[PDB]
Design a protein around this ligand. Structure first.
Ligand code: HEM
Ligand code: CM5
Ligand code: CM5
Length: 463
């Protein structure tokens, strides 16, 4: 049959000349108004089926879950990952890695739970912020550090002190790669990769930094193997090393060294930046709307008090705080175009045929701003997640972690980090900044990865 409708492309530039300079998101919104919720666009010579609106996204990712469960390539990082690791794998390799990862992170190993690790990280964070004594800070580094430390706890069985210089050198290297992957020069590399990969550019810096991180990950794996107690696995690496030994004879097995290194690197890639940025965005909103922040603090005081630290069971009793977090994620809209998918076979969708391995973009932003589900889509409104009796309510438009078979693997971990970090910080500190609330601008910069909140200063004032 045929592909969904769309603008007429050019030989090598596809529809790039027809794009809007305001961003890809604005262009898709204009293209939606002309062709509907599902359309085809050529970014270079690459055909992409774009899904707009809650319906088209749910029909694809949920109703034909298996058909839309493929993962599309990110060219700037494909030389490192090469289809290994949980985020970039496909087929049987993906199924085995995802099953194993889910179980390991869920049905753990180690001593303490993920929640207990997050509570300990939150306690360390409070002590570090107390030491600041209300000085102006840029919270980017600390929020990168706490989220990295959660992943470290899971994969390496330990956390790092916030001032550990070797931890900070590799962290800087990792987050620089993130800023580079998302730059305009990397966006251009994604459009004309086969050509641009022969000249100097950000792709070389990304590659060098990640090979350095992979070297460190490799050394940790060897060190885990040399100090291994098979009856007491400490973390993800130990559990994976035991599975490698169990599958030693099976040559079909995916449980090898490359999948280990790149699965660990994948967890840092997926599990740090978005969580950190959600926190950064949330604190910016809390500066802009002090009456919301005040109300969260009142709810913390009523349910938790000022003595004990927040625990995950407290969330069920704090619908206002829970609604605020949902609204931070919704308005934050940090992954506006989703993470690219592909169809795993020639697929029939709304009368069209999407050929096998065609790339698909589920535009999560169009669900997060859907006027069917949100009364004031462009305005911060916790009421979007509260019913007339003040209880938390479910919303079909709320999909910041996507849907279907590729749904965010760490959703439960991320949601727990948001709850415990926001409440533990606010239980102990009030916030201020040199910019008056009325002058705070929440407009993001659209980057390669997603929406980047502006940089800002903040004070954490002990209570
Ligand atoms: C607020 C924080 C976060 C948000 C909004 C978020 C969002 C997402 C989204 C939109 C996807 C793409 C799903 C798709 O292909 O349709 C994704 C994938 C994924 N996320 Fe998250 N994520 C966050 C935190 C994390 C955390 C903390 C971890 C790990 C501990 C994590 C692990 C993953 C992995 C491994 C995948 C790939 C899933 C797969 O290909 O099977 N995420 N996430
Ligand atoms: O001693 C070792 C320790 O055993 C070892 O844990 C330590 O590692 C410090 C670097 C930790 C890097 C962790 C980051 C990796 C990239 C993503 C963010 C987290 O280095 C020390 C010096 O080599
Ligand atoms: O085009 C964009 C697409 O709109 C966009 O969906 C795609 O994926 C970036 C999604 C960002 C998710 C955050 C990171 C973690 C997962 C792996 C690397 C990216 O990158 C493309 C290249 O910039």
């Amino acid at each position: 049959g045929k592909l969904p409708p769309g603008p007429s492309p050019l030989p090598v530039l596809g529809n790039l000349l027809q794009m809007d300079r305001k961003g890809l998101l604005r262009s898709f919104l204009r293209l939606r108004e002309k062709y509907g919720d599902v359309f085809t666009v050529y970014l270079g010579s690459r055909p992409v089926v774009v899904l707009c609106g809650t319906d088209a996204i749910r029909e694809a990712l949920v109703d034909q879950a298996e058909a839309f469960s493929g993962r599309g390539k990110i060219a700037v990082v494909d030389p490192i990952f090469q289809g290994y690791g949980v985020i970039f794998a496909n087929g049987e390799r993906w199924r085995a890695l995802r099953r194993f990862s889910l179980a390991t992170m869920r049905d753990f190993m180690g001593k303490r739970s993920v929640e207990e690790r997050i509570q300990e990280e939150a306690r360390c964070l409070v002590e570090e912020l107390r030491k600041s004594k209300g000085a102006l800070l840029d919270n980017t580094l600390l929020f990168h550090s706490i989220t990295s430390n959660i992943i470290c706890s899971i994969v390496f069985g330990k956390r790092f002190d916030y001032k550990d210089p070797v931890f900070l050198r590799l962290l800087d290297l990792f987050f620089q790669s993130f800023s580079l992957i998302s730059s305009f020069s990397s966006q251009v590399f994604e459009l004309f990769p086969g050509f641009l990969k022969y000249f100097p550019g950000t792709h070389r810096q990304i590659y060098r930094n990640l090979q350095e991180i992979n070297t460190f990950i490799g050394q940790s794996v060897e060190k885990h193997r040399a100090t291994l107690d098979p009856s007491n696995p400490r973390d993800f690496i130990d559990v994976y090393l035991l599975r490698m030994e169990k599958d030693k004879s099976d040559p079909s097995s995916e449980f090898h060294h490359q999948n280990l290194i790149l699965t660990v690197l994948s967890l840092f890639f997926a599990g740090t930046e978005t969580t950190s940025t959600t926190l950064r965005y949330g604190f910016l909103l809390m500066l802009k709307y002090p009456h919301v922040t005040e109300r969260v603090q009142k709810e913390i005081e009523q349910v938790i008090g000022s003595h004990r630290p927040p625990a995950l069971d407290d969330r069920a009793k704090m619908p206002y705080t829970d609604a605020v977090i949902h609204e931070i994620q919704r308005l934050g809209d940090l992954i506006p175009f989703g993470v690219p998918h592909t169809v795993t076979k020639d697929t029939q969708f709304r009368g069209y045929v999407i050929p096998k391995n065609t790339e698909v973009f589920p535009v999560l932003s169009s669900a997060l701003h859907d006027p069917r589900y949100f009364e004031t889509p462009n305005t911060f409104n916790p009421g979007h997640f509260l019913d007339a009796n003040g209880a938390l309510k479910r919303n079909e438009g709320f999909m910041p972690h996507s849907l279907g078979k590729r749904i965010c693997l760490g959703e439960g971990i991320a949601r727990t980090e948001l709850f415990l970090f926001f409440t533990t910080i606010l239980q102990n500190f009030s916030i201020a900044s040199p910019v008056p609330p009325e002058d705070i601008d929440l407009t993001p910069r659209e980057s390669g990865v997603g929406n980047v909140p502006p940089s800002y200063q903040i004070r954490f004032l002990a209570r």
